[PDB]
From a paper:
Cytoplasmic dynein-1 is a conserved, minus-end-directed microtubule motor critical for cell division and long-range intracellular transport in eukaryotic cells. Cellular and structural studies have shown that dynein primarily exists in a pseudo-twofold symmetric, autoinhibited Phi state incompatible with movement along microtubules. LIS1 plays essential roles in the activation of dynein, including relieving autoinhibition and helping assemble the fully active DDA transport complexes.
We identified three major species: individual dynein motors (Open), Phi, and a third state similar to Phi but with two LIS1 β-propellers bound to dynein, which we termed Pre-Chi. To fully understand dynein’s activation pathway, we began by analyzing particles corresponding to Open. We obtained six different Open subclasses, which we categorized based on the linker conformation (bent, intermediate, or straight) and the presence or absence of LIS1.
Residue numbers in the entry:
A (entry chain A): 3636 to 3689
B (entry chain A): 4115 to 4168
C (entry chain A): 4381 to 4401, 4403 to 4498, 4502 to 4545, 4557 to 4593
D (entry chain A): 1454 to 1768, 1775 to 1987, 1996 to 2114, 2128 to 2389, 2409 to 3103
Write the structure that this text describes.
Amino acid sequence: QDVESYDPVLNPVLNREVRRTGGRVLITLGDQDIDLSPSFVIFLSTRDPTVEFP
Amino acid sequence: SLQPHACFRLFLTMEINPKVPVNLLRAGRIFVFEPPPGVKANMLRTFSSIPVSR
Amino acid sequence: HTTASNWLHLIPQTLSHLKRTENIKDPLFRFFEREVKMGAKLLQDVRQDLADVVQVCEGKKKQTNYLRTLINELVKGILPRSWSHYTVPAGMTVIQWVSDFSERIKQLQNISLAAASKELKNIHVCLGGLFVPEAYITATRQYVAQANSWSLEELCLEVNVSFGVTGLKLQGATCNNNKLSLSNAISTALPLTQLRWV
Amino acid sequence: QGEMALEEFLKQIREVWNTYELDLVNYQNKCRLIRGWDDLFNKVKEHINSVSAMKLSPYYKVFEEDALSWEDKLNRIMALFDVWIDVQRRWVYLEGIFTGSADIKHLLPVETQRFQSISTEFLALMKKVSKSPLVMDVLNIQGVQRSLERLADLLGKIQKALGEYLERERSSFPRFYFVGDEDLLEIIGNSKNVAKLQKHFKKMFAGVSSIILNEDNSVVLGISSREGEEVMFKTPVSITEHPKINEWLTLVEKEMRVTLAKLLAESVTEVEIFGKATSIDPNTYITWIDKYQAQLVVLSAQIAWSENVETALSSAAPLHSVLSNVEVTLNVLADSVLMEQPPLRRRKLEHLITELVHQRDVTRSLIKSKIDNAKSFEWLSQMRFYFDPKQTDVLQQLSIQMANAKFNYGFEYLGVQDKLVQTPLTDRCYLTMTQALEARLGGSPFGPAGTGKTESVKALGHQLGRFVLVFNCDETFDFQAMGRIFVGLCQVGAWGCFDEFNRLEERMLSAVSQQVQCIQEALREHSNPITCELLNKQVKVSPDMAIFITMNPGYAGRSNLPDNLKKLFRSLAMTKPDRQLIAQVMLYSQGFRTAEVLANKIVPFFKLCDEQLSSQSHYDFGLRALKSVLVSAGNVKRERIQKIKREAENLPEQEILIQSVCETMVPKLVAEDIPLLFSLLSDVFPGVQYHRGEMTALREELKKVCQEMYLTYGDGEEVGGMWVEKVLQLYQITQINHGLMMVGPSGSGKSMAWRVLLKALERLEGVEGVAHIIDPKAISKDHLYGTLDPNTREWTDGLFTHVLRKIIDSVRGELQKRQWIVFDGDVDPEWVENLNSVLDDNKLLTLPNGERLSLPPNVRIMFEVQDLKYATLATVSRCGMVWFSEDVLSTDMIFNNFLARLRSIPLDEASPMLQIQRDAATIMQPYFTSNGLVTKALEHAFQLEHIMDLTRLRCLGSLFSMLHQACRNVAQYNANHPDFPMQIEQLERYIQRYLVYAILWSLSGDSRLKMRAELGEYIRRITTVPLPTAPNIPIIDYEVSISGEWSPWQAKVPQIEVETHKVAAPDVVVPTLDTVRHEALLYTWLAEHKPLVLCGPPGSGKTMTLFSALRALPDMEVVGLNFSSATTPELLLKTFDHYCEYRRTPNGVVLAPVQLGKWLVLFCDEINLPDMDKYGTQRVISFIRQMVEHGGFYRTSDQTWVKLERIQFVGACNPPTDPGRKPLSHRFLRHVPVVYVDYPGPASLTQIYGTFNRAMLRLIPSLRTYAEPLTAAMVEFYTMSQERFTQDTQPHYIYSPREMTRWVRGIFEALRPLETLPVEGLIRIWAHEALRLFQDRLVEDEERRWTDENIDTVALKHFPNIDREKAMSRPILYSNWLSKDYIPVDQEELRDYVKARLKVFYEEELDVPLVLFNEVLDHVLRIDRIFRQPQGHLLLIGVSGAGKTTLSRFVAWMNGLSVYQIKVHRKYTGEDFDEDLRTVLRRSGCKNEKIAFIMDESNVLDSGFLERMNTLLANGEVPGLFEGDEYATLMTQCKEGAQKEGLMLDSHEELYKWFTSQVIRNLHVVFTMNPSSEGLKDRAATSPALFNRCVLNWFGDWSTEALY
Ligand SMILES: Nc1ncnc2c1ncn2[C@@H]1O[C@H](COP(=O)(O)OP(=O)(O)OP(=O)(O)O)[C@@H](O)[C@H]1O
Ligand SMILES: Nc1ncnc2c1ncn2[C@@H]1O[C@H](COP(=O)(O)OP(=O)(O)O)[C@@H](O)[C@H]1O
Ligand SMILES: Nc1ncnc2c1ncn2[C@@H]1O[C@H](COP(=O)(O)OP(=O)(O)O)[C@@H](O)[C@H]1O
Ligand SMILES: Nc1ncnc2c1ncn2[C@@H]1O[C@H](COP(=O)(O)OP(=O)(O)O)[C@@H](O)[C@H]1O
Ligand SMILES: [Mg+2]
Ligand SMILES: [Mg+2]
């Protein structure tokens, strides 16, 4: 919730900038390498219709 | 993000300023205090404000 | 920019010039001299700004930052801060301010013509068109005081409808035989107000 | 014999130093400290002066060694004793507090142990120094410097750490809240000395300035005011009982009140037995006045009058009797004041006359109407006084009353103060504020400045006997600070009179409204041991609280009061004071027979002056000016009466008032208003007349000083008459005024005026005159005034505050000298409003601590400003103006000063240089007299127009520097010809032409070619000087040879052919006429280490010309400084930190470069860019002007004058008409000459790049015949592209020869390894480079197609009989991936190769699929082309999600670069950005690896990001990024990297140079941002490197072709 204060840590996740280490799936997040399961989804909520996004 | 006590009222007093967030304007109930229309209404509020025992 | 150039071409058709016209001990002469000098300075800066805008809007000349500020102010319709040197009533519009300033320049031209021919005492001035009407009142009081060799602090004002002023307008009253009657008219123009010092 | 006399003087010095020992006195049977430092310091300083005088002349060369030994030993002992006085002064009160104060070891055990160790060390040193009192023996102890430094440092540390006990001590004695930390430490430490407390009672009490003590200092006999009035206690308080300091201070403050009550009772008894008679005896009346103090006398008179009026109204005859008695008394007062009295008694007389005339007016108004009963409101409205002797409580015997508001007199000793003329407006204010006080509401008068608001509140407080405080609050007054001052006022029972309350940071105003409400509730509870909650603490509230507010509505757009705080104050509007009544009462009180006539002629005079005079920003004719005129009139009347008595009679009161008016108001007038004001004076006062002059002694001393320091002095009608009269007026205003300004245009001579006046006053009165020159805008307001730490309640002193505190303390005898604090800047209400209480009659500076620093009478705060168009009336009114007009200083006296400075003071500092200088001066004497030639040429230069506003003094100083260069050139020629010296006629005929050349390049150095030719034509027409006979060639195209004739620079420029190795190298300059003229003129500037400014359009060649000029000077090191919109002097301070060191010398600290023998030159590349404040000032420009004019700046660490040793400036700027430029101040442009370097133009550009193309087309000999058509096509295409792609369309549409240089370099780099090329291939590579340089920055398809049409038609026109199909095509792609060389490739093979590389790239780094098309192919080729070149940065403009950073990552991976992104998160601040930059810089320079620093616009959070990115992009290094530990780590890593590479380097400068080279070769920054209408303009303004050193590529949205 509260995507008004959007944190840019989610940019590689949303862009799906993902590595390929053989059969394993590797992504970067901050300063650590993260393996993500394929069954991962994320939703961002907002209670403010009159919000401006960059 | 809270469920408060039954007899709890938060009072926010402010001047009419565009800087007030639209989120807070939508969340709260807005009361506008203005100079009265008419001598009759002015004297009515004056007499209601001054206590009878005085 | 075509519409702006047309408007700035038609603006200085009501503005031509002002005579510069200064060694006299009377307050009236020096007050009129300094008023005409201030009007000439304001007119020459406004004329230079208008010429600059016209040349850079229809012709070959680059754009500076002050010029950009002036052009933006002119398009937005707000008076530039540099032009507003006298008192402007409650933030007027340039459309009527140019007419008011042209009227003031024409008045100062009339003062200059009268001074080219004491001679300036018999003229009639509208106090709205003067930059400093309070200074005009002080100057005429000082003139009558020095001429009659009276006191400078025990002089009262007698008003009839030796100094005539124009442009004064009443508010919710009527003048008849120097007597005031209440009226529902919002403003009745005084034809000519006579200021005699006793 | 002279040498023997000097040796005898040295022997006398040795004897008086071997016979001088430190004087020691026992301190409470503990130690023998040293006192009497003034004589020691005076002896040291006169010995230094004698040694310096002997060193200059005449036989210093024989006693050099022992003279230098004596000099440096004297400096050493001076430094040791300067530290010794400070450490002993701190130690005395530290020992006092740590011994007398109890529960200190129980509360600060580590501090007590530390001070025990320090005390043992200091007593050991005291025993050592008491063993041998001889000063040389004292110097003989080793390690005294380090021992004293450690002692001072640890004493300061424990002094700072002791601050927690100060609040606990303040809770005991309430009055300590207004005393600062170190001052309170002195109070507690010197409690057992008492005599050292006498300089803080002024801050502690109202009028009590000292305490009268006995011989044993055991009993306090009495208290004394500042003016010598003393009050003796009825029952003395004894310290010999051993009470604590707070205990006996409380006893003193109670005894003062009871003593004043007893004396009030006795005095009112005396007045009661006086006033019962219809006639009074002046003898007994004067004895009574001498018997009782001023406030007691006035109070007794008021009590007697009120009682008489009440008894009369109790019952019309008694009211007439009371009025008659009042008139008889007032006549007695007037007759007594008409003669001569002692000053204190005379001021008592004046207060009595004011009060009695108010009483007479009140009785007249009461008897004019029919009043019968005492309960009528016509009498109940006026303030009345009641005395009840039957009240057994002596404090509550007097009851001040008004309309239903009973009051009790506070009985605080006010001393004397200054009474106020009780106008009807003042009575209305009294009634309203006393109604507010009865209602327990604080008062709040408001109105324009000068109506008498704070003085009315202070007068009301003095009438009530309340201790009043005036605070000049500002935006730095925090909620905690207001809580502290409120709790102090609550403890003491005082009044608050916060002045200018509206400028208090609205949030803080709302916050302090709660504290005000709590105080109001506490007072209401008292009205019915009360407490109120302030700062979450309960404090007792005395019932004498009053919070008064003084404010001007909309004075400078200040903050507005919220309604919550407005409801807690009773407002009052007051705009028109009774100036007539004030003037009449003041003149009648001072003693004037025609008092009413003088008032009725002076108040309408001021009314006429406010209208008939011209409107100027520095005119004030208000009530403050009127009161200053009245006070000066009284003083000059006293002086004239004393002068007559030196020989009652009659005096010319009209003439006295005229003289006062003239002396106060004449200097502020403009040159056209003197006859107008004289006409006003003659009109109002017919037989007025005036007298001036009679200042022979000061005038002749001023003439002597002017002759000594090479100034021009006039006799009043001579050449310097206006300037000397202005100096005399400045002297008069300093004498009769408090704070001054010198308002006038730049170059009016105000600095020399006040300097010469100060030196003349020095040599006349014999008192030392020291001047402190402060620039208030070169530093922050916090550094100027102070800063309160938000965490701990500690105060860091500002510059002005530190200077004033040092003068107040006067440990070096600063009070006996003459101090002139000079603010050499410009005035705006951000910081000058803090001095409102300073420049007022309060004479005290207010701080947020509650510490109020008084202003000593020897200090005159002076202003040296250019204009007051941003200053407010509240600060214009308080000062005394001196108007320095531009025509006050005429150019002939500048010429005379220059000629004198040339005749004397030789440049290489009798002498051959001095002889050559004198010869040149007598050659150029005829050209400087009156009009001559130089003045006419300067007037014509004024009539011309320039790229900057031409002041006379800028070009005039530039001409003077050029003439000094001519003299140096003559000296160098004589040195190079030792056999044959310079012939006098050759020198004459050489200087006679160098003068014309210098005035040409000085007056027309900043103008266009046609106008410098026009000035040359005017000079040729106007001068009789031999000139070249070339009708077409201008004079500006000629040089003067040392033989004395004219030669062109066309002979100087050769037709050099550069080598193929360096075709477009950065250091390669092909010479042209403009180039050689500009570097010759630059060398002429730089030879005297003078600042300069290189103005011109971007890419014109300004830094190339500057570096070509500096390459001829081997002893100069150039450092690059880049300025942006958000530039601060912190950048220059960081550069000084990195490349220079701070040394210590006995005559102050100096700042010199680390590499000795070299003159560091600072190159500010965008000096024009720093943002202009809303009051029209620039901090960086003010800083540079301060350190160019005054020769140094101020270090904000410890407030010390740091003097630049070898530092000079060069500046570069675009013209001020460019979109982001704001014009420089005239006060900064006064010093810097400016030269306008323009674009080379077609004629110069053709040969400039013909040389480069001819050199480049040598690898292939079959292509060398096409260099001229290639250059013609190149120049024509660049010119025709420059015409319409101007900055008005897009902010980045700038074109310059930098693009032509990049074009030539690109063609050469494509032509190097290829070794065989047809003409078709040459046209193809030329077209490809043209497209890459002229189409990529464009925005629209129409202009892209326009440039394609341009390139096609230019190739067709300049390249006939060519294969158009083979040369021109659609893809025109060039690549070096398929082969080893830069061979053109087709689209399909490139697409297949990119597809295969992306197939490899998917599993390697990023597994995100991409779709290939022509725009992506073009983008990746452009990005690879930029990445290939060194220092290759990118600026990609396009919509989000267009794949810019993905393509950048792919190209960086394929080219071997490493991709870095900063990985921004929440709370990613500047320190985190600095850590990321440090890691990137280390990896790029120390580790020698490629880095593709990808950065997005979303990564920007502050302007510090852009500032560091600007510095990194433009220079390759960020000064101030590495300092200390990380700097040493970088140096070790750089040394290891150099060892790994194979280069053995040492020291630090060359290692940092190699690190910068590694960064500039191995670091690439890619900046991606979204397009915007104003965002691009703002980014260009805030970072010019992103638009200069970054290659721009407008990717934009996907086109329709791309989408399909
Ligand atoms: N009376 C004088 N006779 C001859 N030369 C003078 C005289 N007064 C000033 N000058 C010359 O004028 C120069 C500039 O004057 P000054 O240094 O007083 O600057 P200023 O008017 O205070 O300037 P700013 O307003 O920029 O601070 C001085 O360096 C000095 O050489
Ligand atoms: N009624 C008065 N009688 C005598 N002097 C007055 C009177 N009112 C004002 N003044 C003088 O005029 C000056 C006005 O200062 P003031 O207006 O009180 O400062 P501020 O603008 O901060 O309120 C003061 O120096 C005061 O001495
Ligand atoms: N006479 C010349 N000879 C050789 N190159 C020149 C000449 N004049 C200008 N240039 C080119 O112009 C560029 C200089 O621009 P520069 O001095 O950096 O402008 P700015 O300092 O305003 O950015 C250099 O790249 C240089 O190649
Ligand atoms: N040519 C292309 N073909 C397919 N997808 C693309 C292409 N260009 C960009 N993308 C998409 O855009 C995303 C990359 O976003 P990014 O590179 O941050 O855009 P920008 O650089 O414009 O901010 C990737 O997830 C990718 O799916
Ligand atoms: Mg005030
Ligand atoms: Mg100066």
